[PDB]
Amino acid sequence: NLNETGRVLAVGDGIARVFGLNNIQAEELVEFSSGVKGMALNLEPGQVGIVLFGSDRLVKEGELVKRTGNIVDVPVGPGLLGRVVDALGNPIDGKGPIDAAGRSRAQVKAPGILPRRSVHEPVQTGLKAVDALVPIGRGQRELIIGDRQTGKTAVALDTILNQKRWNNGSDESKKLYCVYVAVGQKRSTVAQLVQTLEQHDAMKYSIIVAATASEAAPLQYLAPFTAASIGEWFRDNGKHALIVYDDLSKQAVAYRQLSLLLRRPPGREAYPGDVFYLHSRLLERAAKLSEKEGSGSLTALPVIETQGGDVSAYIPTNVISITDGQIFLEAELFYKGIRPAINVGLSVSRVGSAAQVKALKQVAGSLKLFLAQYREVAAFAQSDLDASTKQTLVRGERLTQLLKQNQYSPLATEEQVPLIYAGVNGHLDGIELSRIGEFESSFLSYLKSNHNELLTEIREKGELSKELLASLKSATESFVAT
Amino acid sequence: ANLNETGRVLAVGDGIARVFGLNNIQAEELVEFSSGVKGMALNLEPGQVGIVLFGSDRLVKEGELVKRTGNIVDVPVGPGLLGRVVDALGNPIDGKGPIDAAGRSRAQVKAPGILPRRSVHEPVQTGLKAVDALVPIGRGQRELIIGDRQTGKTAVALDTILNQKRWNNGSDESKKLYCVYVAVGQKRSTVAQLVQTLEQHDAMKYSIIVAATASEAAPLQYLAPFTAASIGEWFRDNGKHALIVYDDLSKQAVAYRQLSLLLRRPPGREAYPGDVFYLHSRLLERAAKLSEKEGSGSLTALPVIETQGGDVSAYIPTNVISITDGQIFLEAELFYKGIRPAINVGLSVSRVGSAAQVKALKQVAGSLKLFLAQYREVAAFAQSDLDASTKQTLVRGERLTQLLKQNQYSPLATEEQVPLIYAGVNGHLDGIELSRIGEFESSFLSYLKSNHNELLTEIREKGELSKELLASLKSATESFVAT
Amino acid sequence: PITGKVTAVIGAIVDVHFEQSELPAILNALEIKTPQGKLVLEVAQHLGENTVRTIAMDGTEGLVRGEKVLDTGGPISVPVGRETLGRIINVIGEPIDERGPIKSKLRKPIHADPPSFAEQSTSAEILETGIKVVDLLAPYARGGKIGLFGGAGVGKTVFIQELINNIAKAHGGFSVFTGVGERTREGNDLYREMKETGVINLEGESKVALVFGQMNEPPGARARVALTGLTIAEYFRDEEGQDVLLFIDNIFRFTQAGSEVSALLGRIPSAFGYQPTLATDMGLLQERITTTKKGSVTSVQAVYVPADDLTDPAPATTFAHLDATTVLSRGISELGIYPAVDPLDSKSRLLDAAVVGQEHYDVASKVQETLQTYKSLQDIIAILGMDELSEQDKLTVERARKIQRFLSQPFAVAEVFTGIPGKLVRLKDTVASFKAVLEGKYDNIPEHAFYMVGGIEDVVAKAEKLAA
Numbered sequence A: 001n002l003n004e005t006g007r008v009l010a011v012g013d014g015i016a017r018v019f020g021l022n023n024i025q026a027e028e029l030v031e032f033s034s035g036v037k038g039m040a041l042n043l044e045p046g047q048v049g050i051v052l053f054g055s056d057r058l059v060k061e062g063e064l065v066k067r068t069g070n071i072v073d074v075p076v077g078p079g080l081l082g083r084v085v086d087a088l089g090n091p092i093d094g095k096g097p098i099d100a101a102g103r104s105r106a107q108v109k110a111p112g113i114l115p116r117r118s119v120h121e122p123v124q125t126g127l128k129a130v131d132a133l134v135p136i137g138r139g140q141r142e143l144i145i146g147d148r149q150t151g152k153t154a155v156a157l158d159t160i161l162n163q164k165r166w167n168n169g170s171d172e173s174k175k176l177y178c179v180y181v182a183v184g185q186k187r188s189t190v191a192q193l194v195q196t197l198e199q200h201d202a203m204k205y206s207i208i209v210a211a212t213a214s215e216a217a218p219l220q221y222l223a224p225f226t227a228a229s230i231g232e233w234f235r236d237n238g239k240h241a242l243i244v245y246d247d248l249s250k251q252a253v254a255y256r257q258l259s260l261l262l263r264r265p266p267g268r269e270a271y272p273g274d275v276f277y278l279h280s281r282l283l284e285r286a287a288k289l290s291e292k293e294g295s296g297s298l299t300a301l302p303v304i305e306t307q308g309g310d311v312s313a314y315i316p317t318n319v320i321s322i323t324d325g326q327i328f329l330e331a332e333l334f335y336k337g338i339r340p341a342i343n344v345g346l347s348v349s350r351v352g353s354a355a356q357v358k359a360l361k362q363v364a365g366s367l368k369l370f371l372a373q374y375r376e377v378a379a380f381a382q383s384d385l386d387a388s389t390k391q392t393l394v395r396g397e398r399l400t401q402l403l404k405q406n407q408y409s410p411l412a413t414e415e416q417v418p419l420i421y422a423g424v425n426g427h428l429d430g431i432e433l434s435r436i437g438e439f440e441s442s443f444l445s446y447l448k449s450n451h452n453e454l455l456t457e458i459r460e461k462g463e464l465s466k467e468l469l470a471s472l473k474s475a476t477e478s479f480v481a482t
Numbered sequence B: 001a002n003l004n005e006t007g008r009v010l011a012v013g014d015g016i017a018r019v020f021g022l023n024n025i026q027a028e029e030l031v032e033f034s035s036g037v038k039g040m041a042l043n044l045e046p047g048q049v050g051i052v053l054f055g056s057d058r059l060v061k062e063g064e065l066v067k068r069t070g071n072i073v074d075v076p077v078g079p080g081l082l083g084r085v086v087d088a089l090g091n092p093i094d095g096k097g098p099i100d101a102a103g104r105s106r107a108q109v110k111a112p113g114i115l116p117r118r119s120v121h122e123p124v125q126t127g128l129k130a131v132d133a134l135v136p137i138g139r140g141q142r143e144l145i146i147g148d149r150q151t152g153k154t155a156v157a158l159d160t161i162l163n164q165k166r167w168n169n170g171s172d173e174s175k176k177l178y179c180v181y182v183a184v185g186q187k188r189s190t191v192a193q194l195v196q197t198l199e200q201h202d203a204m205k206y207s208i209i210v211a212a213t214a215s216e217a218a219p220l221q222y223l224a225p226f227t228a229a230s231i232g233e234w235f236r237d238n239g240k241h242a243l244i245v246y247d248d249l250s251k252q253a254v255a256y257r258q259l260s261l262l263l264r265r266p267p268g269r270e271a272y273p274g275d276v277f278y279l280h281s282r283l284l285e286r287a288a289k290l291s292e293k294e295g296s297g298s299l300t301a302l303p304v305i306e307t308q309g310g311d312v313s314a315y316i317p318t319n320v321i322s323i324t325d326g327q328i329f330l331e332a333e334l335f336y337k338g339i340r341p342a343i344n345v346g347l348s349v350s351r352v353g354s355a356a357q358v359k360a361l362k363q364v365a366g367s368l369k370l371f372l373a374q375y376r377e378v379a380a381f382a383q384s385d386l387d388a389s390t391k392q393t394l395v396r397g398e399r400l401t402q403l404l405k406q407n408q409y410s411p412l413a414t415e416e417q418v419p420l421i422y423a424g425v426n427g428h429l430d431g432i433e434l435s436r437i438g439e440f441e442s443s444f445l446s447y448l449k450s451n452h453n454e455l456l457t458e459i460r461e462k463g464e465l466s467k468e469l470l471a472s473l474k475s476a477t478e479s480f481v482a483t
Numbered sequence C: 001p002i003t004g005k006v007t008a009v010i011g012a013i014v015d016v017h018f019e020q021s022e023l024p025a026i027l028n029a030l031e032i033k034t035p036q037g038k039l040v041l042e043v044a045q046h047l048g049e050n051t052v053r054t055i056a057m058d059g060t061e062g063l064v065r066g067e068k069v070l071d072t073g074g075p076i077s078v079p080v081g082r083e084t085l086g087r088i089i090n091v092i093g094e095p096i097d098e099r100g101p102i103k104s105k106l107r108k109p110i111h112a113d114p115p116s117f118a119e120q121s122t123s124a125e126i127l128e129t130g131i132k133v134v135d136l137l138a139p140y141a142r143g144g145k146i147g148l149f150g151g152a153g154v155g156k157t158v159f160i161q162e163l164i165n166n167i168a169k170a171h172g173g174f175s176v177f178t179g180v181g182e183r184t185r186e187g188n189d190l191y192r193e194m195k196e197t198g199v200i201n202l203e204g205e206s207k208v209a210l211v212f213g214q215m216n217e218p219p220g221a222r223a224r225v226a227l228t229g230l231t232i233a234e235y236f237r238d239e240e241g242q243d244v245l246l247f248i249d250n251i252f253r254f255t256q257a258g259s260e261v262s263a264l265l266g267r268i269p270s271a272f273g274y275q276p277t278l279a280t281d282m283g284l285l286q287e288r289i290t291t292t293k294k295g296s297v298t299s300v301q302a303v304y305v306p307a308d309d310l311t312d313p314a315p316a317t318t319f320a321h322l323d324a325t326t327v328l329s330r331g332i333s334e335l336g337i338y339p340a341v342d343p344l345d346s347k348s349r350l351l352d353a354a355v356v357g358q359e360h361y362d363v364a365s366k367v368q369e370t371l372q373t374y375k376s377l378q379d380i381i382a383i384l385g386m387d388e389l390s391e392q393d394k395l396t397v398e399r400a401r402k403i404q405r406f407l408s409q410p411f412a413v414a415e416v417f418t419g420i421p422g423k424l425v426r427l428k429d430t431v432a433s434f435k436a437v438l439e440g441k442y443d444n445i446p447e448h449a450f451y452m453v454g455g456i457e458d459v460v461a462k463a464e465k466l467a468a
């Protein structure tokens, strides 16, 4: 036969070198005699180089290999909501077949120059520190970067948890569907994550694509692109989806493993010289589409693990240059108690204020300023100081404390602005730092009991009129004195 | 078609061309390809020749005819190359037509051995108050100009060439310094704008520009300094004196690394090949003063190296520093402030040019060398005391620091220099404001030229300072300082 | 009609077989017809046995050993001339704005030889930029390259857009903006703002041409796009005699892309991972930006510095080619000065008594030295107050503060965002205007009159409106 079939020349280390397959397409899925699949990455003169999707004890020299005729693709559509799939879209949750609207290629061209509209709509994380200081808009790529065990996943997960507000409504323009890509994590971690989303009733709008620690590198390499197509169905049909790639370090690692094994030329840190293309292919697919094309959007929170905060390392550098900003998390801030351990002076949203609820932009425009000033004068915290430099100190200390938050408890926008109006505009400088916790708790509940009126208007108009600041000022000053 | 004289291309990529045949080719022989592009036979094997291209690979296809030359890589030399601008293969690029050449020296020539040399003793006059007093350059010496990006490195070489106009109009055949300026990896415009500066100052007539610029294939840049050496050597070989400026060897070493990596040689320190020391060493060793038994001709090299952020311990800086006979180190920190030439005195040395210093400079610059490296002592530890004892040093130093400051394209005669350094060393500036030191020079040199031209003619003629002429320099300086 | 056959596919690297002596020269474009459209391949090597190694300009997924490959006869060619203006173009000269074909009168090969040493202009000369800060303190070289520093938050796209404007009005030259590795979201951003600002005018006349080579394009495409844009920019010089602007944003991403291609072709990396051809690759592009007897390409190139390490071979090699720099700063922005040029940080090789004339040089030098003495006072002005100022110093501080505000200027392009009319200030104005201020002829005009105005007459006029 030979055009549609091949024989195995040699096999080992997840590579099978195959004779024949004369009509195979670059990156076509293939199928071996034992039942393991794999994909044609190297079309060479005498032979094809195929990376295995399964243990290579399954393949032997001489074994028959079959074309399948299709480039790797994946089932896409709402039939996947609440499901946990493998990288190829096979369900693993024990919940039976996945009904697909249709199938879609792993690799797909990102929306070009033209079919995009400027990012303008909030992705509400519900995290004061983020929403106030590093606002993400629908369409944006905002990196979550930091060392091990710093809070990277939490920042995505609490964002995912926050979408409850709109995903429990009927207006689909407000809804944010959720794709979480588990790459290179151990299985119980992904299982413990799903158990959490299930507990917070956030599975119902989420998709978990999980290519885990003990899976063939190509599957880990593929998971991000595969899920990006899953996420793209939403984008491409006038809806909005958030995708979290957790994390791109580990993907980079599997890609590298493939490349070295296929003997492609290594470079800095032994990554192939197209690793940057690997991530930009992937992250440019997040986009806000133009009105002409549905106005749908995909939004990406990629995760990157750093080593000793070394952003200069190859992959961190690639990704930091590809995205639209970093939320940068730090061990030290964490132990200090500053959780999320966001380092403000190092974090950015390149979209910024256009991605932010006008109400929050209003009270927190200054907030941007002060913490900046706080940080310059910071080391003075240790006596004989100005009335200028101590006021800076008093206010900062408090806003820093305001911005602390517990895990799994993202706040509504109408709960954030009054907390941040309070901070920014001096109404906290009297309260001792130990109580800014119990204060936030007590102030919101009080505001709920008595001033449900303005909470609603903040939530509904999203703006703050002049009467509203004056009302807010009244409700705040009345709570402080008591 | 002979397989001995002719070849067919097997493959071409990464600057190399593989040719089948050429069975009578020599190791290091030039070849001509179908399109006119030339190459060199680098590696000679059973069944194929490895040829390095002197141009874009686009210019050589598989299956192409390649003709032998018979000739090892070489250039035209001779006196007919003055006022010309050639490329690395000696091809004329100034549009001024055929090169009129006395003949063809090779690119790789061996340096004269232990025997055929004499020590340096004659001045290469730079006209730069700092160089000629503190780092004197001999005729046959090799003095490295070294410093960061944009620190007046080229400026020293250039003003040295524009200073040669002085004797390069004269009858005396021996005090003539013919020049070779080698542009390696420079911008095409910079080199064109540089020629125009030699043209305006009427210096182009005694100089030769060899250029392999930013865009040209690496082996051309690699080659340029060598074919410049042969061009220079002619003068050395025929009882004359050529000055060669390699601008710069940094970029040559970079070109050579490209060539090396494309050829897959083991990369060492900073990915330079094992033999990058050797690349330069064989180059700069072709500068010599010859013994009268060989015609006394002299080649003098002023190579330029570019440090990165002031670090002289880098691989390529230390290699050339351990080939050359000294360094004029120019400093980003000084240049930023205004002290230009930014000759960091402490870190600058001439190793053989001692004998070559005009006595009159040596006399008024007596231990000015070791004082200035020691005004640097107090000036770095006074920023601690208001000491009357150490404030005259800080005011000799500060005045002398302004005294050695110089405008560009303004090289000075020996005679113009000695009285400036007399007025400094002997303290005649201590009462004069700092902001007027630059006005002192210009007023003083006019006052000297208008009245005391008898003293000025005499320094030039002797090359010495008679106790009479020093007792007179005292009178003219005190007289002008009071008014 | 020269055909070949794909014999190898590894990522963006494709090998192709041809018949003896029908082999395409290195750098020739090849074409495979996809259902997408067309896949272009650039010849890079003759491997032997009639095969060629090539680098893809788009994805190679779905390719098949044996697929037919047409030889285009030459390098990648791109539309040139007036018809390119106002259009978006990818590396291979295709329109990507969905506005139909560029029915340009020609197409030109992106790989071309630079002007000869003979063709080279002999005297560097200023490019009058209409912008105050720049023409006085760090003037652009005509034919030169200028590194534009600082990213978001500093008014960059407007600075760039006013240059396009002012040049097209004061010299009748057009512009080519080439985005190399730009973010697509930001390419879209820029297109929308060029229409808003008027520099792209889809009905009327357009001042600029857009060439984009995005991050998600394979290394080959990103390596090459700068050339495409340049080739468009060259034709306006060579056939129109125009002084032309070429914006390359970002030049660092061109180095990175070149680095990536070299790795993929199997070349041994040089120092720090960069290609071994880093300098010649840089040379091959930069050397084409220059003055000819016809006119000049003048390029403004955003430069990114990795880890702020000016010694990393990337910037080091880039800097060797820069004639001047324009440094936009958050520090100048926050003070209220538009554009946000740092007048003590922006430097020019052409700020030289020889190039600009002694009048020009003397003014600019004192302006700097003034603002420099003023900087080291910002410390003690905050502690010792103001009263403790000496005879010369009390006056120069109050004067610097006026000069600091005279360096700001309203841009004609920003008028839609601002409401303030825009002024194009001449060099003869700028030097003269600042020469008068320095001497003490306007020490009795209150600060606010120097802020956001054109030529000296605009200080006089506004000061007499700040009295009504």
Ligand SMILES: Nc1ncnc2c1ncn2[C@@H]1O[C@H](COP(=O)(O)OP(=O)(O)NP(=O)(O)O)[C@@H](O)[C@H]1O
Pocket: A146, A147, A148, A149, A150, A151, A152, A153, A154, A155, A339, A340, A405, A406, A407
């Ligand atoms: N806002 C928060 N407040 C308090 N604790 C938190 C917060 N966010 C995260 N944590 C806890 O801090 C630890 C690390 O957070 P986690 O989200 O696991 O970070 P990570 O970067 O994913 N670490 P890893 O993935 O294991 O490299 C976990 O115990 C979290 O429960």
Ligand SMILES: Nc1ncnc2c1ncn2[C@@H]1O[C@H](COP(=O)(O)OP(=O)(O)NP(=O)(O)O)[C@@H](O)[C@H]1O
Pocket: B148, B149, B150, B151, B152, B153, B154, B155, B156, B340, B341, B406, B407, B408, C349, C352
């Ligand atoms: N004695 C001098 N006085 C004042 N300016 C000078 C002097 N010498 C050189 N310069 C100027 O300083 C700048 C840089 O000097 P240059 O001679 O080009 O140094 P360089 O080391 O060649 N820089 P580059 O070649 O770009 O690495 C130029 O504008 C020179 O004209």
Ligand SMILES: [Mg+2]
Pocket: A152, A153, A246
């Ligand atoms: Mg995690």
Ligand SMILES: [Mg+2]
Pocket: B153, B154, B155, B247
């Ligand atoms: Mg130089």
